[PDB]
Design a protein around this nucleic acid. Structure first.
Ligand code: MG
Ligand code: MG
Ligand code: MG
Ligand code: MG
Ligand code: MG
Ligand code: MG
Ligand code: MG
Ligand code: MG
Ligand code: MG
Ligand code: MG
Ligand code: MG
Ligand code: MG
Ligand code: MG
Ligand code: MG
Ligand code: MG
Ligand code: MG
Ligand code: MG
Ligand code: MG
Ligand code: MG
Ligand code: MG
Ligand code: MG
Ligand code: MG
Ligand code: MG
Ligand code: MG
Ligand code: ZN
Lengths: 129, 48, 79, 134, 141
RNA sequence: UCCAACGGGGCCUUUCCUUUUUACUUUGAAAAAAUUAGAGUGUUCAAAGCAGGCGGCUCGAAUAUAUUAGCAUGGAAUAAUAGAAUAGGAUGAUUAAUAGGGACGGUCGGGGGCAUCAGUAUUCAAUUGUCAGAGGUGAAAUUCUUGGAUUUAUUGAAGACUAACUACUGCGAAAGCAUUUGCCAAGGACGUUUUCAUUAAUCAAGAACGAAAGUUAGGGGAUCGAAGAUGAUCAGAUACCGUCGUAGUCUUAACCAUAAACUAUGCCGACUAGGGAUCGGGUGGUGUUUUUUUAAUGA
RNA sequence: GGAUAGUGGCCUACCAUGGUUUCAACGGGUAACGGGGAAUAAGGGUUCGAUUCCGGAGAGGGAGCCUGAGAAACGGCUACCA
């Protein structure tokens, strides 16, 4: 049964990127998915995406430009202190500024650099590079 | 190999057989298209 | 090549009801006129019951596996 | 899914699973049950006392032969007879029948060497830095 | 995704996107209410009532046409079920199987299905007790 | 007097009646000294020890460190938790998940249980015609046979079993399931603009069924047949065969719970290639076989 | 109610039948005094900590006491065992 919609969305995006598809369809949609995709967008890993409202969980169509090496979810959403953030970036990213680790904090969903700038912390959602 | 080759042979033969049957139907329909392009007692019984 | 966001209308018509971009029913409703009484009654396309004219108690359709078969002599319009 | 729970509240199942499975290791089992020294040559000790029964290769002709350097020793702890090496034929003179010898780990099958005789190191006797007390 | 079976069928009804009444529908909402009350008085269950209204009266969906679900409309008029409809049919189906097993003791197949039906009842009975739709002392036979 | 911004005060968006807390995270106290990290200092150097110098000098350890539990504090996300939520004139909330359950419609199936019908075949028995062999093997001998064997024809009885149709087709959780008809309940898929609204997945504990063989007590006992007896012990491709045949094979009521009980391969969910054959349901088109106010519906 | 410096099944009398437990009670093993700490490690972890400081407990093994503000003391007392 569907446990993590975000995992399914990110895996579908990964398979589309691997196969070279220029656009991918994600069902069901969620606020967490939209925020995560917005972070990827801001960092340029994805382009435009459009949300289709069907009076149900909804759908998303994402255009892909081939700039995404990998995107994944860290399940379970571990609690992360500010000191621990560096450790996570050491485990999930091939290099030190290559990629981002995305955290859901009291100030919203943001990459680790923004969380450090704002001095906030929370749980970890995933990574993109 | 073994029994599996024999089963492969049968399916291929059936597939080949189907192609011949279908081509016959296409040939016949073409003939019908070309055909379409180009005693008092019997008339009373023509309906039968 | 195809645009998932703006699919062709013919393409979606071929797809299953639930597999389209926004799922919706392929069924419809009908204005069926009673033969005996000439009154008009609404009948669901895939009706599961033998719809009878209220005035005359005459069967208008008979249920089937899919679309209900309208009784002989009953005229109909899509509403 | 890797065949293990990953939920954030599944610590107990992870802990109990590890404890049960740790006993599969032979090293872990021996460490906990205190049976790791059964395989030891001396049963857990680094050196073993013995009694010199005979100098078996004493009649061999070739000097400093491997056989000439073998002595049969009876372990005092359990009474098991074993063979030990002496450093050389010169050191064979200091060893005599019925004397206390200390053995240490080392003709295959000879896995011990004599380090002390009558409480005195052989090398000290060989180097003429001590006299064997009788 | 059938429970108690290996079937993977997806057959279902597809609710239309629009949540407003059809344009062609030109019957008063109140008249629809009286039809629901009459059919329930005759003894039809809410599932069967919706089929009749949709079949012969053009009622696409009671909630869409009237704004309230058939179950709420009946309770607003004093018509309520003794137990939830889905639980009612499961118990009735089990009763029929138990009656057959009484006459036929060698039907090991029917014996197997009774366990599946009964275990389905316990899962459904447990849900309603939690929601308090069903009294906590309620137990199946 | 008007328009565009920037700013203030009053109202309105209620006719009447019924009827947030936690988790998590930030920050601050606290967590003895010694120990650890760190700053200064020519113990002759070092390991160490150590806090005060000049006559106001703006000189000097500036210090830090601890997973959890308790205390105080800032938090918008995430995850649980709540509502006189969008209520009614008997009564509060949102979707209706290509999650699940239930319902309805016409189907589909060698799915199951109880009856019922048929089919030859095997064995046996009655009658019937004829006469020397029949059987079996690689070859023979027990065996049957002039009271007629084997073979022929007309029948009858018993107990099993459903050939050909039979297919890389169908059903069932698996084991398994092929004659007709009827009854009893069950079921997958499909159709649905019907219904409930999270009721779900995996599963220690705990439960039902489980080929063949086998155990207990009745019934039946045709065919085959472990065991046992007996004929022959000559010939290596036909080298273990022939006759009688106990238990068993069948069924009723309980035990046994094992198979190479196989994808030699945990389950649930999502995604990632092309192709056309088949089974079941549904939709549309078309023209052949069809056929007609009995009805009913096909290929 | 008694006893205590005092709360309290701490004990007594009379009442109820309670209390803990698969979120592991109860029982068993421990070459189990606990901690600050020590070692190793890149990080997570693993091991050691009788041993300079803090806290507990003991004075050959059980039991009971006098004095005193304070001890169930042991370089105080009395009995039993060795
Ligand atoms: Mg996977
Ligand atoms: Mg179903
Ligand atoms: Mg199946
Ligand atoms: Mg359903
Ligand atoms: Mg704390
Ligand atoms: Mg649904
Ligand atoms: Mg049905
Ligand atoms: Mg004869
Ligand atoms: Mg078939
Ligand atoms: Mg047949
Ligand atoms: Mg018997
Ligand atoms: Mg099998
Ligand atoms: Mg899968
Ligand atoms: Mg088809
Ligand atoms: Mg008492
Ligand atoms: Mg210890
Ligand atoms: Mg101890
Ligand atoms: Mg200590
Ligand atoms: Mg003391
Ligand atoms: Mg002593
Ligand atoms: Mg004093
Ligand atoms: Mg004392
Ligand atoms: Mg003393
Ligand atoms: Mg003292
Ligand atoms: Zn009429």
């Amino acid at each position: 049964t569907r446990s993590s919609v975000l995992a399914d969305a990110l895996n579908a995006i990964n398979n589309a990127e691997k196969t070279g598809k220029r656009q991918v369809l994600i069902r069901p949609s969620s606020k967490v998915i939209i925020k995560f995709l917005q972070v990827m967008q801001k960092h340029g890993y994805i382009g435009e995406f459009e949300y289709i409202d069907d009076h149900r969980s909804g759908k998303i169509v994402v255009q892909l430009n081939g700039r995404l090496n990998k995107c994944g979810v860290i399940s379970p959403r571990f609690n992360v202190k500010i000191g621990d953030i560096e450790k996570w970036t050491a485990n999930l990213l091939p290099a030190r500024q290559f990629g981002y680790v995305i955290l859901t904090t009291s100030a919203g969903i943001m990459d680790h650099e923004e969380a450090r700038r704002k001095h906030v912390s929370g749980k970890i959602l995933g990574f993109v590079y | 190999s073994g029994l599996r080759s024999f089963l492969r042979k049968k399916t291929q033969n059936v597939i080949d057989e189907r192609k011949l049957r279908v081509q016959k139907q296409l040939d016949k329909e073409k003939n019908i298209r070309k055909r379409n392009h180009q005693d008092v007692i019997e008339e009373a019984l023509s309906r039968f | 090549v195809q645009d998932l966001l703006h699919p062709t209308a013919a393409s979606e018509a071929r797809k299953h009801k639930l597999k389209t971009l926004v799922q919706g029913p392929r069924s419809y409703f009908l204005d069926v006129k009673c033969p005996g009484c000439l009154n008009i009654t609404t009948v669901f396309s895939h009706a599961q019951t033998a719809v009878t004219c209220e005035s005359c108690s005459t069967i208008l359709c008979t249920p089937t596996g899919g679309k209900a078969k309208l009784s002989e002599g009953t005229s109909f319009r899509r509403k | 899914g890797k065949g293990k729970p990953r939920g954030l509240n599944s610590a107990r199942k992870l802990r109990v699973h590890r404890r049960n499975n740790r006993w599969a290791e032979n090293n872990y089992k021996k460490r906990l049950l205190g049976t790791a020294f059964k395989s030891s040559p001396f049963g857990g000790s680094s050196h073993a006392k013995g009694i010199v029964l005979e100098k078996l290769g004493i009649e061999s002709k070739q000097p400093n032969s491997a056989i000439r350097k073998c002595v049969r020793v009876q372990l005092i702890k359990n009474g098991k007879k074993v063979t030990a090496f002496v450093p050389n034929d010169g050191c064979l003179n200091f060893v005599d029948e019925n004397d206390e010898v200390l053995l240490a780990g080392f003709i295959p099958g000879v896995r011990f060497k004599v380090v002390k005789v009558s409480g005195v190191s052989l090398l000290a006797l060989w180097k003429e830095k001590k006299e064997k007390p009788r | 995704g059938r429970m108690h079976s290996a079937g993977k069928g997806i057959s279902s009804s597809a609710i239309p996107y629009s949540r407003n009444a059809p344009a062609w529908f030109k019957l008063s909402s109140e008249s629809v209410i009286e039809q629901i009350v009459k059919y329930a008085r005759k003894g039809l269950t809410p599932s069967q009532i919706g089929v009749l209204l949709r079949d012969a009266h053009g009622v696409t969906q009671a909630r869409v046409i009237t704004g309230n679900k058939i179950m709420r409309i009946l309770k607003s008029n004093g018509l309520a079920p003794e137990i939830p409809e889905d639980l009612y049919y499961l118990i009735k189906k089990a009763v029929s199987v138990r009656k057959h097993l009484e006459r036929n003791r060698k039907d090991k197949d029917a014996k197997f299905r009774l366990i599946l039906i009964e275990s389905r009842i316990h899962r459904l009975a447990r849900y309603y007790r939690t929601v308090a739709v069903l009294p906590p002392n309620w137990k199946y036979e």
